[PDB]
Amino acid sequence: MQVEGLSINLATIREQCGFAEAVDICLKHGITAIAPWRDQVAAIGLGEAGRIVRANGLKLTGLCRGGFFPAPDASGREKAIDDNRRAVDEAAELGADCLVLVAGGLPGGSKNIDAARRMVVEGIAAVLPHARAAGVPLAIEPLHPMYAADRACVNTLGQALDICETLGPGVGVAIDVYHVWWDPDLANQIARAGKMKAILAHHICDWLVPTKDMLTDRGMMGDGVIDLKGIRRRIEAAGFHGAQEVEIFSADNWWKRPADEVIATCVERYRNCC
Amino acid sequence: MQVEGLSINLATIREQCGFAEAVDICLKHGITAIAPWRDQVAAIGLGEAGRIVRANGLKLTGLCRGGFFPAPDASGREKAIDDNRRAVDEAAELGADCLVLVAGGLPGGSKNIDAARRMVVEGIAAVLPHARAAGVPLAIEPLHPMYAADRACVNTLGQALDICETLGPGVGVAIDVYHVWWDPDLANQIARAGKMKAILAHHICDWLVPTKDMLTDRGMMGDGVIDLKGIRRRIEAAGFHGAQEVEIFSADNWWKRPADEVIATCVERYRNCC
Ligand SMILES: [Zn+2]
Ligand SMILES: [Zn+2]
Numbered sequence A, B: 001m002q003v004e005g006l007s008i009n010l011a012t013i014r015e016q017c018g019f020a021e022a023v024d025i026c027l028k029h030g031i032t033a034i035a036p037w038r039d040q041v042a043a044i045g046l047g048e049a050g051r052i053v054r055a056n057g058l059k060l061t062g063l064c065r066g067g068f069f070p071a072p073d074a075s076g077r078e079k080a081i082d083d084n085r086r087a088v089d090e091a092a093e094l095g096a097d098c099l100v101l102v103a104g105g106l107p108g109g110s111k112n113i114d115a116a117r118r119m120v121v122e123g124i125a126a127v128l129p130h131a132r133a134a135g136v137p138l139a140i141e142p143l144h145p146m147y148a149a150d151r152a153c154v155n156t157l158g159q160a161l162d163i164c165e166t167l168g169p170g171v172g173v174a175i176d177v178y179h180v181w182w183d184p185d186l187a188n189q190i191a192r193a194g195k196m197k198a199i200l201a202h203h204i205c206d207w208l209v210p211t212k213d214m215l216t217d218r219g220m221m222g223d224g225v226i227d228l229k230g231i232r233r234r235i236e237a238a239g240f241h242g243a244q245e246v247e248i249f250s251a252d253n254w255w256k257r258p259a260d261e262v263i264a265t266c267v268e269r270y271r272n273c274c
Helices: A019-028 A038-044 A046-056 A074-094 A113-134 A157-167 A186-195 A228-237 A259-273 B019-028 B038-044 B046-056 B074-094 B113-134 B157-167 B186-195 B228-237 B259-273
Strands: A006-009 A033-035 A063-067 A099-102 A138-140 A171-176 A199-204 A244-246 B006-009 B033-035 B063-067 B099-102 B138-140 B171-176 B199-204 B244-246
Touching: A006 A259, A019 A033, A019 A038, A019 A046, A019 A259, A038 A046, A038 A063, A038 A074, A046 A074, A063 A074, A063 A113, A074 A099, A074 A113, A113 A138, A113 A157, A113 A171, A138 A157, A157 A171, A157 A186, A171 A186, A186 A199, A186 A228, A199 A228, A244 A259, B006 B259, B019 B033, B019 B038, B019 B046, B019 B259, B038 B046, B038 B063, B038 B074, B046 B074, B063 B074, B063 B113, B074 B099, B074 B113, B113 B138, B113 B157, B113 B171, B138 B157, B157 B171, B157 B186, B171 B186, B186 B199, B186 B228, B199 B228, B244 B259
Parallel strands: A006 A033, A006 A244, A063 A099, A099 A138, A138 A171, A171 A199, A199 A244, B006 B033, B006 B244, B063 B099, B099 B138, B138 B171, B171 B199, B199 B244
Antiparallel strands: none
């Protein structure tokens, strides 16, 4: 009956379903773990979202997302930090296993990528006490390098782990195959993450050939070229046995299909291709 | 009169100009270094291209390109290796400072990215004796990670340098800001390249915000977010003082403008923004 070890990031059916319907279809397929987004939670209301979570015994593999730290001035940086505190409060209410952090790109006008990265480290450090007090692990999600300028300037698992080592307890990593599959040093950095006890989440999807859009053409698992099986074996060998979270952005395919069929296909591909 | 230290990769005006006209406009602006592509050379003829090169005293900062090593079988891999030998012969005829190598993506159907990378190393090793005998340095060009699956599975300068160390003399790197600007370890790897005496080329352009296409929306220098000045200072500190090669693929902007204006703008932006 239950599909053990599978979570659905609700972006996967974001065009078709708001929060309650997404949960309903996931439960209809034996799925008891989700990762909602803050806008989806806000649209239903945080209190109702947590009631649904607690009533159905749902695990949250993550809440998406905090981050977005760099800004051209102190006021803007603190506005971002303070938003992350709200995100932590939301995650805590929902019992999320972590708050996913998407670092933010360059401050407007700036070319100073190293400074942007320092603002990320400082921003995480500013949020950490709030997160630790709330019992909410912070998961730095290294993002594909194509996102460096304008979405997230933490772009390798090695770099993410360097930040985890600098900041100390309460911060780990979310390993999303879309963002990291290409990294020539991926095997060593997964092993490193495991030694650090830093792995908080594992997101799955695929890299299509060709990829037709930089943001909204993620593949269903098995439709692309990622060695999903190999990555998962390495993550398990590193000591992480949590659910695999399906996170697909697909403007011209999966978002245009009935949510039922999408989730059915996620379960099939999870069984066969992961 | 002369614009010292500037080269134009002829992709920059590829829609507007074949080889002879491209050279003419570059010389009209005081530019005496180019990097043509093999298709452009073939369209005019290798003999005529070399005559033009020798008559005008042109430097070639590169010939684009060899590579494309991985294939599902030995016959296909050897076909690729043998093409690279032809590319070396072309580079030698034109007096090119290097042959740029774009590694190739995964063999069709395969998910085995590590094996693809082994085929790259083996392929370069197979070509090297031909290149060394011809006097043609091979320049491994790490490519942006977004190209990993289907164009080039050498995706970081560190990885490129690892291959250079494995293979030994006659192989170095082409450092293209588009492909490497995001790398969190870029400063250390540029310094490393310099210690290895491995830097063979420096390609310039910019990363736009937003980037509107994965292949054909490179920016004119200064229109994007790359710290061009900083990268160049590090390349010079590492011991490379060769020309900066402008390589812009811009389907909706620079390729639609008069070649004259494009090259004029390259010289202005080279002066101000590099
Ligand atoms: Zn993710
Ligand atoms: Zn290049």
